[PDB]
Design a protein around this ligand. Sequence first.
Ligand code: HEM
Ligand SMILES: [Ca+2]
Length: 389
Amino acid sequence: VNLMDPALMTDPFRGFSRIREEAPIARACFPGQDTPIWLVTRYDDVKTVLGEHRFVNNPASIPDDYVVYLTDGILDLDGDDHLRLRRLVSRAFTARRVMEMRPRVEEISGRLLDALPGDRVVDLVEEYAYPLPITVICELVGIPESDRPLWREWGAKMVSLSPGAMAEPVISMVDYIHDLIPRRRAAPADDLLTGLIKAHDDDGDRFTDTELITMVLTLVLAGHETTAHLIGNGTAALLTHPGQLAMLRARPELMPRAVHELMRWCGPVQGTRVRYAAEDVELGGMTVKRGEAVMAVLVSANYDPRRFERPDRLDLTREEDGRREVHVGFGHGLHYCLGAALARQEGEVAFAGLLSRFPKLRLAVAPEELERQLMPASWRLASLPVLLR
Ligand code: HEM
Ligand SMILES: [Ca+2]
């Protein structure tokens, strides 16, 4: 009764909100459906689904030599295997590291912004939103500065090559990380790669080299395009909302709350990967059967009027306390985004940077003319043309 392609893609906000209201647990129909898929759209039900341990991400619960790096990543694991990797990665990817990243993200962002020209239209997606978060992950991980252009190029190729060729930069990145790990282990420094290498549980358990390569690749893949589109989408939102933008410039302490609202209103991830029922589960007055799939819809949860009053309004002041996170744009439960604090920091830094350097920052086309890169479960611009001066 629900089919995923037609004009849902163009307006997922109205499309999934109508569904939320009329059919809060609905069947979704996709070609090659190896099971029934249940679409879950209410805020409370999306949190129920994402917090439920009976839902698993792997139904079990590129050369052949590279396959592991793409299949055993943290988001693909459940139960005890997940518990272990999450515990291990949390010993290295710490609060201290995130706090210490702030001035580094400020310097990186500033150097990018400072090189942008005033004498032509600037594409903020290609020229800033994409290079920043890959560079930030380079800095976090400790990729040698000399090789950051190479990493940005691999990142750019991952987004722009055909799907028959997208493997090449992935494999090259793997090879790079494989080579770098023993170097960093022989020459340790205060960076996240060292942190990962040296992390160990109190009983001695620790990452294998395979797991270290997989984890590094995961952070890049999970953190590059997502963060890019938070920056692009949030900037476009601000530049089309002059009253909210003026408030934000007048009250820059609003930035953390402003980022929460931009995530709720136009965050780039609109659905999570499919969950599978490990056993029968009662959910909002029905029963999901063992083996059936469930797709949590973040965008409809984040626009749910049961939770957010006038949810269609972009209100940067909506949440009073920048410490509270009410939206599900970073997910929920055991797979809640590992990078959320870093991503929110990149957003705060990016939006503050843009506003501070460019009082005359403005869109260079009417918003109806922006091109969305249509893509399942995503909300992303193809480009963001602006004038800086
Ligand atoms: C800053 C860099 C980022 C890194 C390093 C990062 C890393 C990750 C990782 C490793 C996971 C999987 C964790 C697990 O399975 O236990 C994850 C999940 C997730 N992240 Fe991120 N992330 C980043 C940015 C973002 C951004 C900007 C968004 C959204 C706009 C986002 C949304 C998500 C969501 C929704 C999940 C959960 C997926 C699910 O349950 O299916 N992340 N993140
Ligand atoms: Ca995407």
